[model samples]
Target: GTFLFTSESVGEGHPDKICDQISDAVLDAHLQQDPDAKVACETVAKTGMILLAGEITSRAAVDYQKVVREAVKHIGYDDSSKGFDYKTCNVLVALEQQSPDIAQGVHLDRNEEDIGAGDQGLMFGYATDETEECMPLTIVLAHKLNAKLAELRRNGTLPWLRPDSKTQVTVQYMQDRGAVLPIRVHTIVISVQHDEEVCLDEMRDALKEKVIKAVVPAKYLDEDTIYHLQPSGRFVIGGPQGDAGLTGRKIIVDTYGGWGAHGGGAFSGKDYTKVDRSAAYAARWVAKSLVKGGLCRRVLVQVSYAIGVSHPLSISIFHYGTSQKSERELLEIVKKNFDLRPGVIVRDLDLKKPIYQRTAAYGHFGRDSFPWEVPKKLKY
Candidate 1:
């Protein structure tokens, strides 16, 4: 049997992305100045206003308003004609210190091995051999298409292109027995924002060549492939003005793009002590390592934590029957190799650096740049 699966990705100027980037920017500012910073900043943007509200416990004095403005400006939201301007938008701040009760559980003064989790939550990490990146092909192509649109916009190749845009890819796969094999791309849907001066006819042709062709591999495209470029016709009104944005709203796009289950814990505004962020990344690292080491073709790693507890409440692994090793053996290997405690996860992944803001727009996993994306040499 054959089936289709779809995934979507958004550009940096997307409303929700604006909030995510701002929140991560605040986190990075605090982390850069004070490695011990505990930041869980949330941001919301709508119309001509941007609001920052959350908890921060750090010696680092961050100019919250400054970070918000700079982040919006960098995302090319500077023109008022586009409905939201970084310079003209009002900035509101309502941040507070992290709760002492939460701090007592996660403070560094605790034993290195016993630094408690910032909160109780579950997280899932997933990997597949569908693409060279060991990520689902639908998401890989979707992210690249959106990224290509952004590249064209900034470099003048697509001068009329705006920052807020989205791309989705639908892939056809063969489901024979229990194995899945990607056959070809069935459909492509792209909704791009552009200046009022541009004509739909010209824009579609340009994008078909520069964006679609440049990003998607030729092998995955075929004669029956369908395209719906800018299906809504006009997209001049976008970003925060067109919609309200909240941080952590794009969790699916940020991770595996619906290829695997999510624990319902959002990542952007939380610090490493929050297992929502750290354990999620650790699971990805573990899953990727298993795939890279030829232990499995696809895997999902899950870990759950309790607030004020250093040890995980539960841990599990799923290989989808793609591995020769027993599930119990795989679990044993993971338990022996990876230290899933919140404190060790932070230190192992060097999570205290100003490296999070870059991950705000693109998918967080699959990319080779991040430390967690690097597969570890596992002893099987």
Candidate 2:
């Protein structure tokens, strides 16, 4: 039987993405000033209030309120009439120092000796050759369309495009004997927020002609291909005004859609010390390397850690029956080639930098420019 695979991604201006960007921006800022900084920041968005709460231990002095506002403003939330304006919004800050016990384990006399993980959690990474970055093409294109929507709005190309929108792509996979093969796109869905003046029909036409057609390749479309442009009419009520948004509500969108199993952990609002963030990055690095090395056609890597542990509790790899080498040999190559430890991943991936702000929206695994996207060259 043929298999249908689908993946969805959100725009950077989406409320949840906004929150994620803010949290990562905070992560980046702290890391920029002090690479050894430990941070766990969470953000909430509502009509006119933006709340930031978390814990951190850093030598750098940060203006939490300013950071939150700057993030919101950058996301095009500069006016209260749009439901929330960064300049006038109430910025609440509740960041505090990390617990003494936690700090003791994370801090080391030498950077290389840092052996503590911010928290114990499981993380998963996956890769496929369907796309150039070893990511599923559906997700890659879905994210591209949504990101372009946000880009048009932010850059004033489409001055009326609102800050909240979503993109979903459904692909019909060519399967043979239980193995998933190439993909044929079935449909594309895009729902975007617009100014009140734009009618539903007009908005749909505009998006179909501009956003969707501009991003998706023409060869992928056929007479049967369908597009749901704002299936529901009238999306003027969007952003935090229409719904409440939390920091990590879009975890599946953050990684691979249900295409692979998830560890049920959130990446935003946490610093690199947290295994939820660092371990996930490490797992992706491993997965990319395995696929690039031609050890597997597709790969999923899992790593779990215990609280305060320097080493991961378990490191496992799955090739979904696409392995060209023995599992033991592949695992050995991964273990030898990559550093699975939280501290090691941080250093190896250059996690102490302020590059996470952009990951809040869209899937994180498929981005090639990110630090985690660097491939591992070892072949078993």
Candidate 3:
């Protein structure tokens, strides 16, 4: 059998990404002071304006506006012409304490139980051998294109490049041995925002010569490989000035780029107590380690948690019948090796740090630089 699958990625300069970084920055600010902080932050961005709204109970005292501007400034949005000015923009803060009822479950533990989940939710983690990173080829390629686009912009290799861009990759898979081989590129698309003075015709040629050719692997390209560069031909306006942006809007892009299943919960702007973020990270670690243990060709791990329960309600492991193990065996292995308690997961992953802003833009699971992406030893 043969089929085509596509995935797309957005750059950190994108408007929605701006809001994501701001929200995570706020979370980091709280974690910096108290690792045990309970935080749920949301941020939205418009032209020259940012609004922060959420619940946070921490001992930290952060200059909210300053942190927001610092995050934006680091993203290369300093000039007023970039549709967002880091210095002159308006910052409005609207935050309140966490609900006592909700905090009671996560903050209190008695008898023999550890801290429970911040809320009830489902989280899924997936991995495959399609790429060295155990991610879909199209998604990895899409992420590469966007990252390369930003690299060229920030490095002055393409000074005309602005703070907004998008990349999409389509892969055609062919079946062999009743299984799928590596994906072959069918087409690649890129759209980059840039300065108005750059000529579209020249820009298209330069991008193909520099960014597209340099980023994608040569084996994936052929005479039939199609490239769509700025199909609209020109894009001088972007960022919040062109369109408003809100937090958690790019949830699909953040997880698996639609190549894998999601539990319908957003990760950004929330602390580790939220199962949406913590357990998802744990599941990824488990899946990657299981794959590393030579257990299967692919893995999708899901864990469901209840608000006041210390143990996950159910642990699911699916490998398309590829693994020589059962869910019971895997569950016992996972439970004995890793601690899924919300507090333990946070401590184990070292999540109470300022590193989340880096993940707010890039796909979170595939990158090994994050602590959660690191492979754990399979005790089974």
Candidate 4:
């Protein structure tokens, strides 16, 4: 069977991405000074204003406004002409110290060392052998396009490029002999904001050569590949000014890009104590471990948790017919090898550091730099 699968990615300057970066930057700031800090920072970006709101309890003494401004500036939003200027934009903060109920629930037993989950939710982790990074081809290509787009903008290769942009990749796939594989790229879409002086025709042609051709491999492209560059045209007015953005809105782009299930919880702005973040990371580590050990070609790991609970309620694995062993056997192996507890996950992954801001853009998985992206040695 043949099919087409598509995935999308937004540049760091995208409105929603700006919010995510700010939120994660705040989290990083707290974690840098206080690894044990509890933070759930949310950010909003619109026009010339930025709003920071959430629950934070930390002894780190972070300058929220400084982090917000630096985040915006780092994303190439320093100029007001782009709609949101880091130097001039209004920054507002509305963070709660902490919810007494949540605080008590998290430390329910008063066991400060062994803390509980900050919130209750389901988290999913997925991996595939379709790519070297064990991520779906569509998402991998989509993320690469965005990364290249930013590279050109920052390095003066695309001088007229602005902070906001988006890229999409549609890969033709085939399912044969109970195995799935990507065949070719069916389509590519790029929508980038540029200076008003740059002509639309020029922009499209340059992007075709620089972004699409540079990111996607030639073997995956064909004469019939459809390219929709700036299909809407006139993207001069973009970024936060063109649209308001909120943190956690790009969950799909943050993870598998619709290739697998997401627990509907955002990853940015939360500390490692939050099961939504920690458990999800642990699940990915487990899934990757299975694939790395040749136990499966693809796997999806799911874990559910309850607020103030240290243990996961359930742990399940889906091998997608690529398992070398029985699903039951694989499940038992995972249960024996991986510790699903929140605190344990954070400790094993060494996640109590200022490494969150880098994950705010591109896809969180597939990057070999992160701890969770590494596979563990499964004890058979």
- Against the reference, the lDDT scores of all candidates come to 0.88, 0.80, 0.82, 0.88
Query: Tens-digit lDDT track for model 1 on 1-380?
Result: 88999999999999998898998999899988898888889898999999999898889988877888999989988888777888889999998899887787577479766888888899999988877778998989899998898888889888888889888999999864344689999999999888999999998898889889999889989899999999999999999888899998999999988887999888887778888999999999999999888998888899998898998999899989888888889999999899999889888899888888898987898885599989889875
Per-residue CA lDDT of model 3 for 211-256, tens digit only, reads: 8888887887899989899998778888888789899888878888
Q: Worst lDDT window (10 residues) for model 1?
A: 174-183
lDDT of 2 at 193: 81
Q: Please tell me which model should have the higher lDDT, number 1 or number 3.
A: 1
Q: Estimate, for each residue in 1-380, the C-alpha lDDT of model 4 and write its tens digit.
A: 89999999899999999999999999999999998888999898888889999999898988877988888889998787677788999999999987988988896555544688788899999988898888989888888888898899999999999989888889999985445699999999999888979999899999999888888889999999999999998999999888899999999999998987999989999998888788888888888899888999888989998898888888889888887688889999999898888878877888887989999999778895599887888887
| Sort order, lDDT high to low | 1, 4, 3, 2
The pairs that clash in candidate 4 are none
| Backbone clashes, each candidate | 0, 1, 0, 0
Q: Which portions of model 4 show Cα errors greater than 4 Å?
A: 108-113
Worst 10 residues of 3 by lDDT: 175-184
The alpha-carbon deviation from the true structure for residue 70 of candidate 4, after best TM-score superposition, in angstroms, is 0.8
Candidate 2, residue 178: lDDT: 26
lDDT score, candidate 3: 0.82
Clash pairs, candidate 1, are: none
